[PDB]
Amino acid sequence: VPKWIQLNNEIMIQKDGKFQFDKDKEAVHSYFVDYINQNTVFFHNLKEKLDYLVENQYYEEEFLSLYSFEDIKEVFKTAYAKKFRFPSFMSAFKFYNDYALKTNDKKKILERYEDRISIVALFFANGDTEKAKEYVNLMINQEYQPSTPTFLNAGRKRRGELVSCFLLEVNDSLNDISRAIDISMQLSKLGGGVSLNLSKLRAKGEAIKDVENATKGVVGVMKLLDNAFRGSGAAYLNIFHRDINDFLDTKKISADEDVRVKTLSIGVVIPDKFVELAREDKAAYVFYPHTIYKEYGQHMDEMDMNEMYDKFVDNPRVKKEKINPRKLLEKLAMLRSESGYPYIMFQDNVNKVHANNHISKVKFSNLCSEVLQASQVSSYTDYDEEDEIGLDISCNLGSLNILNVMEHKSIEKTVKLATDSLTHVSETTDIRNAPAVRRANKAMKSIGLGAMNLHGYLAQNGIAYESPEARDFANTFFMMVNFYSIQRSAEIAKEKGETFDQYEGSTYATGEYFDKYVSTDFSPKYEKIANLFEGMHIPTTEDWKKLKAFVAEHGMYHSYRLCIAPTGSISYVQSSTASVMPIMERIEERTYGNSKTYYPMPGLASNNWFFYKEAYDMDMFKVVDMIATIQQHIDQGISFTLFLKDTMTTRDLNRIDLYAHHRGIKTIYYARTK
Numbered sequence: 001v002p003k004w005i006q007l008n009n010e011i012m013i014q015k016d017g018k019f020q021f022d023k024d025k026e027a028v029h030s031y032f033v034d035y036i037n038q039n040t041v042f043f044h045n046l047k048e049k050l051d052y053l054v055e056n057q058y059y060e061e062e063f064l065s066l067y068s069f070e071d072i073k074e075v076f077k078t079a080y081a082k083k084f085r086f087p088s089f090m091s092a093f094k095f096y097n098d099y100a101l102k103t104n105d106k107k108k109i110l111e112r113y114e115d116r117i118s119i120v121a122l123f124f125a126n127g128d129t130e131k132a133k134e135y136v137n138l139m140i141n142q143e144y145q146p147s148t149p150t151f152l153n154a155g156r157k158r159r160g161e162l163v164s165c166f167l168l169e170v171n172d173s174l175n176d177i178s179r180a181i182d183i184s185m186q187l188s189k190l191g192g193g194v195s196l197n198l199s200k201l202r203a204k205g206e207a208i209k210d211v212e213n214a215t216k217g218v219v220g221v222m223k224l225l226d227n228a229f230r231g232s233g234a235a236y237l238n239i240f241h242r243d244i245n246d247f248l249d250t251k252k253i254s255a256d257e258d259v260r261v262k263t264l265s266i267g268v269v270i271p272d273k274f275v276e277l278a279r280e281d282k283a284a285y286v287f288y289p290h291t292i293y294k295e296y297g298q299h300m301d302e303m304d305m306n307e308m309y310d311k312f313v314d315n316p317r318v319k320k321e322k323i324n325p326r327k328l329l330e331k332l333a334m335l336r337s338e339s340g341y342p343y344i345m346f347q348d349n350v351n352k353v354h355a356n357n358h359i360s361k362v363k364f365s366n367l368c369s370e371v372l373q374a375s376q377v378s379s380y381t382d383y384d385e386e387d388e389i390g391l392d393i394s395c396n397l398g399s400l401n402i403l404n405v406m407e408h409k410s411i412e413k414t415v416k417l418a419t420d421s422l423t424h425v426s427e428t429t430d431i432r433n434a435p436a437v438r439r440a441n442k443a444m445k446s447i448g449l450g451a452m453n454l455h456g457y458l459a460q461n462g463i464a465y466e467s468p469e470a471r472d473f474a475n476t477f478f479m480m481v482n483f484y485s486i487q488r489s490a491e492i493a494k495e496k497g498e499t500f501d502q503y504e505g506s507t508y509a510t511g512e513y514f515d516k517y518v519s520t521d522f523s524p525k526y527e528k529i530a531n532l533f534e535g536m537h538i539p540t541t542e543d544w545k546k547l548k549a550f551v552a553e554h555g556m557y558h559s560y561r562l563c564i565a566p567t568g569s570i571s572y573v574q575s576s577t578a579s580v581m582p583i584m585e586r587i588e589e590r591t592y593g594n595s596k597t598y599y600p601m602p603g604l605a606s607n608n609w610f611f612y613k614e615a616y617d618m619d620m621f622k623v624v625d626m627i628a629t630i631q632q633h634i635d636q637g638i639s640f641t642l643f644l645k646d647t648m649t650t651r652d653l654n655r656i657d658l659y660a661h662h663r664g665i666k667t668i669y670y671a672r673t674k
């Protein structure tokens, strides 16, 4: 058993009635002086090191050639200037195991933490040395953390693409299904998560072909996708689609392997009309989509279900099956208890505050349920015919660290620089053989700036997650993020002289987006929270009015700007609590070969133990209230894990989900039971 693991294990051995939290500091110190520092490669100087890495195909030559070597030296100097030390074994372990560049044989380490940051910053700044130094400071102070794909691969030659999220529409044909599978594997190889909308695919019995897929409906397509992934995959289906019960039964524990889907995540899209039909206890119907396309010349999930539902029911050329809508909502709650699946998207909560309904309404979401954008189906054809390209979704992500941003008083600076980094990654992306995704990147230019360390920050300032004080902080914080995000998007539009495709018809352009911001104040109501924002200018209704006019004049470069991802791996590197979620465990036990490892939550001690309250003991109604408060100021979505007990009944699970719906929650993610 290595010394660093032994020292890490001594945290759980009590001393004077307390956990030995400081033993983690010894553990990480041992990890460096007994392992990491013995496996790093020596170089005489920075010039030799960089020439070696370029010439041996580790780094790309072009992004470095934009700087003079003297300027590169100064950027690297900036990274090593602040004496960065990991506070825990796991934070250091997660960087050097998952992110640090290794030699090709993978026996030595070629990058310190400061080297990766220096290279990522030199990639972002595109020759601008002074901006590269700001990126280094932003990342070394841990104010901003680029997503895994960007942070891992930026500046490297042997790599995937830097984009995290891909969402694909799939039209109703074998050529389309075949192309969607091909594109999914291509994009998954590039390092991104891939989510597929299956709501336009024809239901069971509508496929009259002698192929293995035919007779199972969309489950056949789910199987092909699931097998291919053996980046991860997801599939979404509208609740009014006939195959909804078969779609759900892929995640049953008792389901046989010919129907079962193990790797692929699943999501269900629920409009209000289904919630209306659940409220009044009467039987409802699910539709065979190809019959709807035959009749109306439009896909089911493109048409307005509030208006057309009764018309689909009364039309005899539209085929249907009767269901009990309350019992399907019960089934959803039950599967989420057993499996964690499916994810739920409350479609009208997404679309009632969506800025770009004129392009399209939002029909589905991504692998982690936070990306929420317009899309349009493509039509892929054979050799001698022409493809008709629609609009898929791509979004590259990054996260603010709330703790460090507040302590450095740098909300404006970090949001605007992060937005610039996300914009450069979007500009330098080059997707081949997926023109609907290429269209998304070039024309829509969406980015996904999120945040982590909410609970960690609140807990270390004596603010409980469920308190009105916490919601007061979140309200003001994310308002500010949205303000400076929009401002920078509009500034970039002025500088570049470009806007996102069909900006002119958006709620940003009409002014409607800003209505609540020009009329209501979002500064902190509690004095304790107002003192935390001391030194930072909190935008007022008057600033918002001025921003509204600025946007009306110059437009906006980005179609979407903000979304809060789960941050599973990167949160360790940041010594941060995951996302805006409440923590699961005060101390995480995990396996390490034969031995165990222990990770106390970042900033956990005996004197703040109360404030690091475990998510399972919280009231999920009050957790809903927190995320709803954040969702006000996020144009896309928030990955909302729900934390449950086996004591809860199906009745209790339905009441939580229906309350989430009532408060305007856009999506809910994996359902976690203790």
Ligand SMILES: Nc1ncnc2c1ncn2[C@H]1C[C@H](O)[C@@H](COP(=O)(O)O)O1
Residues within 6 Å of the ligand: 028, 029, 030, 032, 033, 037, 084, 085, 086, 087, 088, 092
């Ligand atoms: N916690 C932590 N994070 C990062 N790097 C670390 C850490 N502990 C030790 N080291 C590395 C940094 C130096 O190269 C050397 C001496 O660190 P010194 O601080 O002089 O003991 O070990």
